[PDB]
Amino acid sequence: NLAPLPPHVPEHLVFDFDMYNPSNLSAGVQEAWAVLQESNVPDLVWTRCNGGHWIATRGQLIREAYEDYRHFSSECPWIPREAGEAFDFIPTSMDPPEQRQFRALANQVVGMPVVDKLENRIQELACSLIESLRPQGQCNFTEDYAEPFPIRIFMLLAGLPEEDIPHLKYLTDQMTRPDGSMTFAEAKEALYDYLIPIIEQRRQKPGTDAISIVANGQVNGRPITSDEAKRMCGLLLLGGLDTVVNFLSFSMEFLAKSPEHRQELIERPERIPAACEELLRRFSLVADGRILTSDYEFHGVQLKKGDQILLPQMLSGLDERENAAPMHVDFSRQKVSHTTFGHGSHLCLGQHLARREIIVTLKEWLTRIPDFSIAPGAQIQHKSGIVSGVQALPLVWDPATTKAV
């Protein structure tokens, strides 16, 4: 429950927020986290939960911390601390200057150029998936679309067989939202155990998949180690299975509950992209953090070398000091401001892939199923963690209102 308050942490700045089971969860994860932005909550608080750590509650501080990699190292980026210490993925667990040489190689496998080529294939699967669901007049969105659409595309980029999805997604989720069956340490080992034989195999018969490309790659000219490649592939895997999956569910849930918005995108299709950014702001869902390299006074607070601080990428865009009426989805919002894909040297390499997936989803679903709602009486539950998500989303619609392409 609560870790004893470190001697150096001010008693008045304690706000025991639990990132894996927030108080207000039933109001929605974002509303649960937004409690940290209420009227008398400080810019920086200390929660005694999960072993104890700082939490920056406003975008201005969240932004400076991410920019200041000398004081806030990504080396122990996960909470609780034990997870943070075993977290050795590349390049995420590294800080410039060493981080860069690997970030470039990772960028080559999932970046915009790679996305452009994946284009037609992504669209085909969105359609294949939506049309096949169309005439049923119902589906449980998380397992019938949110998960297979994103993951499949990733399993293809990685050139991995879909039969492995259940195992990999189980491991990934134990990392983002552990249910207790396994520790971060155990989850990563099993993921590292999965990859090893693949990395050695694609290192002898080099294919064109992302795995082969990282396995046979070079960092600023010298050869990548088998181990370096594993730590890098493991992260990509994490980034491919538990990001978009969850975000799509948040967006589609909001759309199921707001006909007005649906209609806006139906009547005015050119707004889909902007709506996509606005949805990313509103339904932001990642929160990881950093560890203090030395003792440092930050915004009037004494941080002690070794303290962990959670910098909720999720919170920036929900900050009223960044966007007025933040909880309000406005597809015409003139300055959509957020840090949903992060901030600093670790900006999300997969945002171009994520945006395309999101925008093709909106376009193709609204085209075939403009009217849909949450199943009657269904009580939607969110889940909080490093990546927040949706437990299930039952959707229903009248087949008669649909249109095949």
Ligand X SMILES: Clc1cc(Cl)cc(Cl)c1
Which two tokens mark 179?
């249910």
State the Cα–Cα distance between residues 298 and 116, nearest whole angstrom: 42
Which residue in the list 47, 176, 243, 339 is annotated as catalytic? 243
Please choose, from the candidates 401, 128, 369, the residue with its C-alpha nearest in 3D space to the C-alpha of residue 252: 369
- Scanning 163-171, 233-241, 250-258, 392-400 for contacts with ligand X by CB under 6 A, the matching segment is 233-241
Using CB under 6 A as the binding criterion, the count of chain residues that bind ligand X stands at 10
Quick one: which of 340, 361, 367, 384 contacts ligand HEM (CB under 6 A)? 340
Residue 327 C-beta-side C-alpha neighbours within 13 Å: 11
Which residue in the list 157, 160, 349, 353 is annotated as catalytic? 349
Please choose, from the candidates 91, 78, 85, 386, the residue with its C-alpha nearest in 3D space to the C-alpha of residue 233: 91
CB 50, CB 79: distance < 8 Å: yes
Work out the number of other CB atoms within 10 angstroms of the CB of residue 405. 9
Catalytic annotation present for 350: yes
State the Cα–Cα distance between residues 29 and 26, nearest whole angstrom: 8
Q: State which of positions 77-106 bind K ion (CB under 5 A).
A: 85, 87
State the Cα–Cα distance between residues 325 and 225, nearest whole angstrom: 49
- 348 annotated among ligand-binding-site residues: yes
Q: What type of residue is 241?
A: L
Quick one: which of 106, 238, 318, 369 contacts ligand X (CB under 6 A)? 238
Q: State which of positions 69-98 bind ligand HEM (CB under 6 A).
A: 74, 77, 91-92
Which residue in the list 144, 173, 209, 242 is annotated as catalytic? 242
Using the minimum distance from each CB to ligand HEM, give the nearer residue, 272 or 353.
353
CB 215, CB 233: distance < 8 Å: yes
Catalytic annotation present for 348: yes
Q: State which of positions 187-226 bind ligand HEM (CB under 6 A).
A: none
99 contributes a contact to ligand X by CB under 6 A = no
Q: Residues at the annotated binding site for heme?
A: 348
Q: What is the contact surface with ligand X in residues (CB under 6 A)?
A: 77, 92, 235, 238-239, 243, 286, 288, 386-387
Give the residue numbers annotated as catalytic, written as ranges: 177, 242-243, 348-350
Q: What is the contact surface with K ion in residues (CB under 5 A)?
A: 76, 85, 87
